[PDB]
Design a protein around this ligand. Structure first.
Ligand SMILES: CCCCCCCCCCCCCCCC(=O)CSCCNC(=O)CCNC(=O)[C@H](O)C(C)(C)COP(=O)(O)OP(=O)(O)OC[C@H]1O[C@@H](n2cnc3c(N)ncnc32)[C@H](O)[C@@H]1OP(=O)(O)O
Ligand SMILES: Cc1ncc(COP(=O)(O)O)c(CN[C@@H](CO)C(=O)O)c1O
Lengths: 497, 421, 46, 130, 22
């Protein structure tokens, strides 16, 4: 009732989302940075001929083995030239519970980041913005957390069988019925790994003569599980409804790729919160478009399930739709609920099929009994203090995003999407933004190349409902100081208040 | 071509439903609800019973020690991690379990995955690529068959447990070696074998298969997810059983779900090969790490193994006298070695139908639940399996089973085997 | 002004030199001036 | 690729080479255009038609291990926005190194032969030929 | 004023045009 489109998807609230176009001045300097590192990267290969000092890395047996190369020299030219140089920014070990302030072990390299040592002193109070702790359910002292985990812990350390033999305990069915009442579906089925939710149930549901309509930037599990099946895969542009409507009415009027035989079925693999970007799926324009062309939707929400919508009920509550338009909803219990595992959600016709024909149910082991009562005794913590931390998370995102935008930075994504990607469009500022904020006593996540485009190296700032106003103003005062130190304030538009 | 009026006319096309209409008759449509922990004396379907289908070979599930160490780590770390191990998601336990696991196998380095089925399906496609060759026992498990179908390489399967077929099949590749030696000097050869077979417990011959590794230039990818804490004087897998230096083997991958009684899987080797899976390991980097109350139960369970290493001896003698018992059984046979703790009770004379056979075997499994015994039959995906085994009962023996409860379990199954067949 | 090190700091971030070694950072620093130093002579000639 | 950002950068590079190759105390001859043309066509042939494979792992199970940068790029499309730009530009240099070289008969064999080593692999009637 | 250059040059100019339209 606010915005209707050429499709039919009627929006009920404004959809603000702007991706700023990288300035053309910065875009030249990137190449000089990636070019010079490539230039000096060879030299370390031409100096690897003498082999006087190869001690940094490892080698084959030589006397024994030494038959074939095993690794391609050019394949790994990026993990030993452009990565190993700034490798101290990712695998940082932790001494305590991850929740708005964490202990970091301090380490130090003498070989220019080829081997580390742990000094012995840890850094005590570090505001972390790299852990997924939506709704602050990651503590070690909680009524829900202490009671559920401890009683269950006496139960069993872990299961030792499979859901079709003796791997089905009484804890697994009282979860399943509870997940179904949460979302509003007929049934559900819990797995034990979100990465194996997607890469084991998609080849159960698609098969050979079918077509998969995948988005440009999915997670690696949807990409892997779509390849284990054997169906044709065609990739459309990120959040582009024009390039989905074209790519779908060209798949029906042309049938298969070698004959012209019609397809068996068409399903569309989308997402929810899109963390590497921060945008949200244009979900009223997919439901109003799949009904025109009679396809299926594999809506999946792992980064939204407890951070979007009035009562944290995924993206379907967000746009004002009922969970009946979509099929096979996916989800993980690691982001919002703070426990491992994933589910799938459907109708009994579908479920009864996945309890029978899925790869995980017959071959692999199930959830463990102490991580399943952390889910039961905290899912209940939302329906009822459960609606306060959802309202707190939604106003921490509005404050942190507008005040970070009025400083001149480039921020991708939607106005209400609790991952905030900050642009660092350069290779040397990847290793420097992560390194300078530790001096400033704050820990962040910097992702460069590989996952994203060459000229799109960014930084993530996953927020939380356990971050107070006094923690955010400590962080926003230091980003302003480390933004001027590295000149990261570039945007033609400055939203001055 | 294809006018706009004509194009819409083609929008009459109706698709198949997503899911086929599952019938009222199938295999395991109805799961066995189990009350309480799956311990020695379990209560399956409201019926006290002494089980023979759980995989805790060492006890270690309802251990007072193991459970005190997992609780001491629940009160200082919480339940779960929050990130995917490259983003603030490593604890002290993760780094300490990888140091301990590697020192327990006296190798150089180990790695940890948070799931049992994704430690091998993520390690085969990291090395094997599009232009390679793999030689597979053909009796391999499902977890191997989906890492092979993900690496996109030429896959050749030899016969089960013989070196005459795997020697026959390497020579055919050595003839295409010389008919194109320009591109036959850039295709690595691998061999994938299993330590003890889940589908049919038999031990593979390593001694005469390793000296064949130095003949032809082919690597070995051992996978001992079922012999890790069983075979050997110190329970170090199958390499301690035959007596082979660990440098000869390129990669060994188990799971921490059977003998360690927990969740997860590892993969230990040399540092020249293990350091590549940290950036290309599919289930390693794009997945949240193992929770820290499961990593403290795996250190303490690995503690107990070494405290008293004589337990492995009362696991080998245990699985020898139940293999001698079930021999006179008329109607069905025993498939397995005298060292393997997981032999199958295959059907001796088949009718001529898988459906008709599955149901026949169930009659026995449903009947023995009335008594002290509890046992299951092996489940498989017939549509997807490459080589499908025959239907069978799986009989697992642990250390917490006495001699009084083994002859009771063999005489009972011998009695109701002639009442169905 | 001692804040010339800030100008030198920007020169390191706008290129890959910052995340580069100590003995290998002057290789680029020698040639750079060598390529400019030959452009100073020709400006006096032609 | 950034369709104005990449192209532009390439243009810059060439220029840089020209000004790094030019203004040399030793040789102040207008035969730097031949030098320019000489370095650039041998520089393109290495990084677009010789080096085989990707510079980083995990693309698609080594699908393009036996492919060249000019083959794999743009998913093999014959005439994309970029396929044309990387072939129109090596021949525009040939117009510039002839207005200044005065149609040298000694440099004609050192310029065209360097032109045919690049233009001929860019023909769509070749592809997989090694 | 090309000796044999113009003949070769003419082919190139035409070559661009038929390549440009695709
Ligand atoms: C300074 C450096 C710093 C280093 C940074 C280190 C970071 C530290 C690690 C921290 C760990 C954090 C992890 C948390 C995870 C997270 O927080 C979200 S991060 C998760 C995001 N992950 C990724 O996106 C990786 C996978 N994505 C791709 O790989 C892309 O797709 C490419 C464009 C690259 C392929 O481009 P391409 O390879 O040129 O295209 P192909 O066709 O060759 O692809 C080969 C086959 O895949 C199919 N396919 C490609 N796309 C597809 C798609 N969209 N949908 C369906 N199928 C697709 C093709 O049809 C081919 O099918 P087949 O022919 O049947 O084999
Ligand atoms: C569709 C889909 N499936 C799976 C995952 C991750 O799986 P997990 O449940 O094993 O973390 C994600 C998010 N992936 C995050 C995990 O926090 C990551 O950083 O990799 C996803 O969007």
């Amino acid at each position: 009732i606010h915005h209707v489109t050429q499709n039919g998807g009627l929006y009920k609230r404004p959809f603000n989302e702007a991706f700023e176009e990288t300035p053309m001045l910065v875009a030249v300097l990137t190449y000089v940075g990636y070019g010079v590192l490539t230039l000096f990267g060879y030299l370390r290969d031409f100096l690897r001929y003498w082999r006087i000092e190869k001690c940094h890395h490892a080698t084959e047996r030589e006397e024994q083995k030494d038959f074939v190369s095993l690794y391609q020299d050019f394949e790994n030219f990026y993990t030993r030239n452009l990565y190993m140089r700034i490798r101290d920014n990712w695998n940082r070990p932790i001494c305590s519970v991850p929740g708005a302030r964490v202990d970091i072990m301090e380490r130090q390299s003498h070989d220019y980041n080829w081997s580390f040592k742990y000094t012995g002193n840890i850094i005590k109070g570090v505001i972390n913005m790299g852990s997924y702790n939506y709704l602050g359910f990651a503590r070690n002292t909680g009524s829900c957390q202490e009671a559920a985990a401890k009683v269950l812990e006496e139960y069993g350390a872990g299961v030792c069988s499979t859901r079709q033999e003796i791997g089905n305990l009484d804890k697994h069915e009282e979860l399943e019925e509870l997940v179904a009442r949460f979302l509003g579906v007929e049934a559900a089925m819990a797995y034990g790994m979100g990465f194996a939710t997607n890469s084991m149930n998609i080849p159960a549901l698609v098969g050979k003569g079918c077509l998969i309509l995948s988005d440009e930037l999915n997670h690696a599990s949807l990409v892997l599980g779509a390849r284990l099946s054997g169906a044709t895969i065609r990739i459309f542009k990120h959040n582009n409804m024009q390039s989905l409507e074209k790519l779908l009415k060209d798949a029906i009027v042309y049938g298969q790729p070698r004959t012209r035989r019609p397809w068996k079925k068409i399903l569309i693999l989308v997402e929810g919160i899109y963390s590497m970007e921060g945008s949200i799926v244009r979900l009223p324009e997919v439901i109003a478009l799949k009904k025109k062309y009679k396809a299926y939707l594999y809506l999946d929400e792992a980064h939204s399930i407890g951070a979007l919508g009035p009562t944290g009920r995924g993206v379907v509550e967000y746009f004002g739709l009922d969970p009946e338009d979509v099929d096979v909803m996916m989800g993980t219990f690691t982001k919002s609920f703070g426990a491992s595992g994933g589910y799938i959600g459907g109708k009994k016709e579908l479920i009864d099929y996945l309890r029978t024909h899925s790869h995980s149910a017959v071959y692999a082991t199930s959830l463990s009994p102490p991580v399943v009562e952390q889910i039961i005794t905290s899912m209940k913590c939302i329906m009822g203090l459960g609606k306060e931390c959802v309202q707190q998370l939604a106003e921490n995102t509005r404050y942190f995003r507008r005040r970070l935008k009025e400083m001149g930075f480039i921020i991708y994504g939607n106005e209400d999407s609790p991952v905030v990607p900050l642009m660092l469009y350069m290779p040397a500022k990847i290793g420097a933004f992560g390194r300078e904020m530790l001096k400033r006593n704050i820990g962040v996540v910097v992702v460069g190349f590989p996952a994203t485009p060459i000229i799109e190296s960014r930084a993530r700032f996953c927020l939380s409902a356990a971050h107070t106003k006094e923690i955010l103003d400590t962080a926003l005062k230091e980003i302003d100081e480390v933004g001027d130190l590295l000149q990261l304030k570039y945007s033609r538009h400055r939203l001055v208040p | 071509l294809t006018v706009k009026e004509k194009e819409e006319l083609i929008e009459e096309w109706q698709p198949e439903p997503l899911v086929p209409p599952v019938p009222k008759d199938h295999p395991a449509l109805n799961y066995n609800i189990v009350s309480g922990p799956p311990s020695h004396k379990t209560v399956v379907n409201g019926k006290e019973c002494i089980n023979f289908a759980s995989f805790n070979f060492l006890g270690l599930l309802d251990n007072p020690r193991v459970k005190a160490a997992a609780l001491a780590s629940l009160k200082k770390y919480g339940v779960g991690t929050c990130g995917p191990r490259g983003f603030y998601g490593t604890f002290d336990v993760h780094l300490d379990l990888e140091d301990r696991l590697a020192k327990f196998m006296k190798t150089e380095e180990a790695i940890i995955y948070s799931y049992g089925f994704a430690t091998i399906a993520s390690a085969i496609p990291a090395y094997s690529k599009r232009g390679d060759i793999v030689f597979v026992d053909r009796a391999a498990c499902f977890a191997i068959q989906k890492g092979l179908q993900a690496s996109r390489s030429d896959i050749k399967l030899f016969k089960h447990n013989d070196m005459a077929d795997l020697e026959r099949l390497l020579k055919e590749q050595e003839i295409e070696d010389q008919k194109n030696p320009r591109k036959a000097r850039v295709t690595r050869r691998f061999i994938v074998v299993e330590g003890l077979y889940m589908n049919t417990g038999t031990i593979c011959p390593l001694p005469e298969l390793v000296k064949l590794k130095y003949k032809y230039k082919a690597r070995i990818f051992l996978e001992e997810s079922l012999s890790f804490g069983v075979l050997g004087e110190h329970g170090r897998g199958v390499t301690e059983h035959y007596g082979i230096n660990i440098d000869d083997i390129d990669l060994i991958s188990a799971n921490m779900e059977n003998a360690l009684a927990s969740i997860g899987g590892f993969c230990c080797g040399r540092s020249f090969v293990i350091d590549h899976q940290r950036l290309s390991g599919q289930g390693y980097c794009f997945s949240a790490s193992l929770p820290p109350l499961l990593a403290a139960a795996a250190i303490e369970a690995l503690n107990i193994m070494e405290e008293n290493p004589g337990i492995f001896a009362v696991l080998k003698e245990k699985c020898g006298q139940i293999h001698k018992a079930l021999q006179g059984i008329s109607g069905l046979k025993v498939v397995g070695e005298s060292l393997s703790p997981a032999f199958h009770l295959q059907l001796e004379e088949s009718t001529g139908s898988r459906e008709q056979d599955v149901r026949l075997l169930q009659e026995i499994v449903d009947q023995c639940m009335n008594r002290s015994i509890a046992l299951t039959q092996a489940r498989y995906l017939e549509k997807e399996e490459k080589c499908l085994p025959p239907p069978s009962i799986r009989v697992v023996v642990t250390v917490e089973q006495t001699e009084e409860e083994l002859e009771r379990a063999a005489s009972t199954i011998k009695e109701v085997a002639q009442a169905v067949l | 002004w001692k804040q010339m090190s800030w100008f030198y700091y920007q020169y390191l971030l706008v290129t890959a030199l910052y995340m580069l070694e100590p003995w290998e950072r002057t290789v680029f620093n020698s040639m750079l001036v060598s390529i400019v130093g030959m452009a100073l002579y020709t400006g006096y000639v032609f | 690729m950034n369709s104005r950002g990449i192209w532009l950068s390439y243009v810059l590079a060439i220029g840089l080479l020209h000004i790094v190759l030019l203004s040399i105390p030793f040789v102040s001859v207008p035969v730097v255009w031949t030098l320019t043309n000489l370095i650039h066509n041998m520089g393109m042939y290495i990084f677009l038609h010789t080096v085989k494979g990707t510079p980083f792992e995990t693309p698609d199970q080594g699908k393009a291990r036996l492919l060249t940068h000019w083959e794999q790029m743009d998913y093999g499309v014959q005439f994309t926005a970029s396929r044309k730009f990387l072939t129109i530009t090596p021949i525009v240099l040939y117009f510039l190194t002839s207005f200044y070289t005065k149609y040298d008969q000694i440099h004609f064999v050192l310029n065209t032969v360097s032109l045919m080593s690049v233009l001929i692999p860019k023909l769509p009637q070749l592809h997989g030929v090694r």
